[PDB]
Amino acid sequence: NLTLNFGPGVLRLVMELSGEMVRKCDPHIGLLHRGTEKLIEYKTYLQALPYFDRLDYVSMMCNEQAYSLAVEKLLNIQPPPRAQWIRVLFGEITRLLNHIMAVTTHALDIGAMTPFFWMFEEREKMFEFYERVSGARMHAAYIRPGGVHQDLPLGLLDDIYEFSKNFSFRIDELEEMLTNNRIWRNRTVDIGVVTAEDALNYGFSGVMLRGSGIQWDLRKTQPYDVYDQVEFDVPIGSRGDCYDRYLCRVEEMRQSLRIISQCLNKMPPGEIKVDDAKVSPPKRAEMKTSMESLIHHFKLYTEGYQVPPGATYTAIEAPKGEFGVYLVSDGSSRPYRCKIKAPGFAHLAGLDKMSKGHMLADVVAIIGTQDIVFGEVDR
Amino acid sequence: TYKFVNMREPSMDMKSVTDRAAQTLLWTELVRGLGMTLSYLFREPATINYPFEKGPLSPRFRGEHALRRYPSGEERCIACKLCEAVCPAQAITIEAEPRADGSRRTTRYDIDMTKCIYCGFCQEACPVDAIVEGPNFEFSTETHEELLYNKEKLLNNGDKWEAEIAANIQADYLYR
Amino acid sequence: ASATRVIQLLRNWASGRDLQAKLQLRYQEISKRTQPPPKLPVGPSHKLSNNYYCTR
């Protein structure tokens, strides 16, 4: 029963082995702790928005949406319908990016490594959509607490439709290479089995719940934007192993394609940010021609908007599970407290339970199926 | 509504059992995966020939910063210090004083490119379109010091890129 | 794509699908990089009257 330290995303893992089996596995975190929650207190809400892209850098617009929803709830305002549809459309696109990344990285860690390139081509195309709308490929800062920053370019919906009508073949090729493979099945089936009661008590969320047979989804039970206006199915597992969660992620990719099609078909006209110049900055022409617009632009970009005092906990169904923000405001233009709840924290906490009586090579598979990105874990 | 992903019961008749045994013994799915890889081998790769071919971009792209100026030749910056106040990373340092003719102008305008996060807040907080985030992205450096831009470097960047900077601004200013 | 017929049949047989129906490389079917000017309609609170701020 020897103890070994797998040292330096990047992770340190101290584990005891009795031969081939794993006795105890303790993960050490803090290698990517930068102190985001403390730096937020020294910035205004708009200045604190970009931190959430760095939070979970595989799913960025989802973090933006969570923070924007929290600030909107505190502000007692709502965005225009077109902004909500853009948020939902982009959120679905981001979910695809996150699921592609997770599945391909898990396969590459196992050793497949071909679907990684096959689907990173599509990830590059998605980066372009992110780039066309906001000028940034990854750290977009597109979604703001008033809606979105800018309207879509005139040729974006057609390109999104053209891209999204050929993605099903990419998913089919991924499933062909992975789903029915006997080596992949032997690597994943009956690995890291977690019961429904343990998954609930251990604070798991997202696929880790849905993989165990629990019928829970925040987009269905507690819709936030335009979700109650789009129809989609929720994949549910039956064994709680890695294979069931992989199948759930693939089916979630397909349902994301479904929601993207619905959002493209049902796009409404109108403005893209709330018509409240005391919260959302006015247009440049209005700023350069109107006195009130100039005053409000000055005050919004220098001091910011004051949020009424109060504490809220806003949670959304991010691609990695329930992503939440507990925001406490004292009435000023700077948040008093911003606690971030990331599903990776609870998942990595339960890793030790989920890796009981498994081989050393099984720990890599379990970590891959947890969908762990340490930016959100460490914050 | 919800779906089941792994709720299929395999058939237990002789034909299905024989088919599964044949799959196990002859490796049909492995051959199918090999055929998929072979089919993917015979199609055109997606690689572009950098640096002779460049990836597509858009007018909204954020790159290396620049300071623009009016057509008459006077710099647009008026030392309002909005970009400094809105910078999330505190990468902008501004010092100003009245000029020889009494115009409100800057004496120091520094951007620390190693602190900047390229969020574009500075170019959208500017009321006179003075500071812009240009479209250049190939400006790597061999030393840390040369990434600490001062007013002269930013003005040189503006004079160098003004053509396509103004073209992009003209193309995109109706969305702002 | 610029592929010969025999290679196309080989790929379609090996994969099991019709590749040329849904290609993964973008061609002229994409939108142009130069677009007409937009108009971007104003929001709902752009009235000249009955628009006091204390009510909204």
Binding site: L157, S168, T179 | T18, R32 | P41
Partner: peptide
């Protein structure tokens, strides 16, 4: 004067988008 012009889907909407899994059987007993 000029009329409102922004990104909207074309009249009649977009075409059907395939999302169902398509895993065929090559065929041999």
């Amino acid at each position: 004067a000029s009329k409102v012009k922004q990104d909207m889907p074309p009249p009649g909407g977009y075409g059907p988008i395939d999302y169902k899994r398509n895993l065929p059987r090559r065929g041999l007993s």
